[PDB]
Amino acid sequence: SDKEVDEVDAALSDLEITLE
Numbered sequence: 001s002d003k004e005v006d007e008v009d010a011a012l013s014d015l016e017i018t019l020e
Contacts, residue, residue: 001007
């Protein structure tokens with residue numbers, strides 16, 4: 001699918017995961 005800047009639908013799980 002993509003990889004350059006990567007997906008952004010995993011970024012929403014890259015916040016809570018780190019803002020947890």
